[PDB]
Amino acid sequence: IYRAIVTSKFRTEKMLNFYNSIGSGPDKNTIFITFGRSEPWSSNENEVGFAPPYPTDSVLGVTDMWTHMMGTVKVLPSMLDAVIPRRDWGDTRYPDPYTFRINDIVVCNSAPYNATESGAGWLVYRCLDVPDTGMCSIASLTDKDECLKLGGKWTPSARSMTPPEGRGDAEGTIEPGDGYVWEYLFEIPPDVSINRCTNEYIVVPWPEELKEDPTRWGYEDNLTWQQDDFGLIYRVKANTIRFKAYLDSVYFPEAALPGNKGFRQISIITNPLEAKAHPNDPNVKAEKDYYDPEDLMRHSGEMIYMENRPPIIMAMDQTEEINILFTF
């Protein structure tokens, strides 16, 4: 018998494969987000706390989605962000605002309780070491080094005195002198932090963004690329993609008339086909930016995600943001 494991990096690998499957240039895939269902779920749908039934993963579910479909929009690479959980140093809204463990990924310079450098965006660090005092996950072990050696996890008893600042050593090492050791990872520009990071997630730049513009992400001093080729997403174990997609009513004016009832569904379909003159004609992949559902081969493509929701009213010359989370 064998002892095999898929590493955490395979999750990142899967996420990156999906992201790289789309785009410009060669033989790449095309993915669409769809919206539909004007017909009310029931007389309830408008009252507070209403929740529609879950979508059904079946042939019938896909068919019903197409029947209610009102529009489709091409998903661009730019609408996809790799994200990881957000942990702000010193945020007293949540537990352990000043206490961390080795490998924790923390944010600084994102708020007053965190400010370290005007003129820099949010600064992200990884905890390399903690104070010798504390306890182990495997209770019996009272020595930090022994705890870690045996695969235990060490919770320090002494808090981080000040937020890590700067980029640190040539290797990015930072020693505040409070027993904690930190490693500088990267910087998040304001356009990203303001518009794409949330209370729960921070964006980690894709490898191509890092090769293209390292200073934008305060990564010009990084040396780890000599081995990891800008795979910051792997280093921080990013495995979730967050969509910042937009449904612009200017391309579907009949779906945003004054007084409309709104839409209730969203779906993602990979590689749908354009409509045909005769069903036996050649398959042509849908590559245009948007399609009235009538202009696509009904039920073509593969529906990988489905979502039912209370009704949202689209307004002309206005856009609606759709956010989706894919975990790999």
Next chain:
Amino acid sequence: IYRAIVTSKFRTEKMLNFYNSIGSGPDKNTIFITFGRSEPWSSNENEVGFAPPYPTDSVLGVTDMWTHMMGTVKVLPSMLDAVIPRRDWGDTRYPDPYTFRINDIVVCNSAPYNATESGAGWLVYRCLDVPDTGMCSIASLTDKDECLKLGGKWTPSARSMTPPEGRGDAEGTIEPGDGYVWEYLFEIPPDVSINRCTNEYIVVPWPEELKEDPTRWGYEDNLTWQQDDFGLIYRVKANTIRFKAYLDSVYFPEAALPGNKGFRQISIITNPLEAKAHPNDPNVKAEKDYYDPEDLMRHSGEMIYMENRPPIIMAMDQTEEINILFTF
């Protein structure tokens, strides 16, 4: 609330993303399978039923894999098969040889108790319907029709009297006349059954090889391609890949000389880099079919799979077949 789900098709999508990612380019992946560790696990290492310890998913574990690494072999697309569980109609060696549920995927024409067409390969079908008499997974429901209406699963009390034969309706529907209704899916060529299938899995052809030669897979009558572009893997919810990689002693003569110690580890690394003359030199992805650890940038690429196994001693003119399963 916003009730969203990822469909079973998303699993097939990730598997396919992975398969199609292999190649040359910045938006593609080169994949290598490594082998190593001649040092014994321990003295019982040879005893029957011996199980080595599990590899460790950490930087130290990657460091150790590289330390013990003996060689690396480039993985080619031809070494990857999409598979689904094999359920042979009437095979009494396993449970429920004659009882099926809607959507079960069954294999016929594989044995005497399964024969339906001399000259043809194994024939794959999907159960569309089952007898009215039976039991619902939701006890308080007597009717079969109702059971399924509430997301239940119906287990018929009457068994299948005979396996389906032929390709069925214009849409592949078959009715043996025993209360079971089947749908013809595809045919597996004889060479594939012998060389790529196992007692546990059967291969499902990839979209491009199927579109390229439908007759090979008894798919020439198919019409669903008018919507699914030959996406059979999605139709049958295929989500695991089986590797068929070969380690030929010719490539590593020294590693396999008489009186061998053998190899005990296998790992899979994506996009490793070749060695550099200077640390600061540009990154060069490895693309040759073979490499000795020494010729790659140590710890380069991302290790997505690690496996420990009992020693296997290679020798003069011998080839070890390595089989791996990735479930997406």
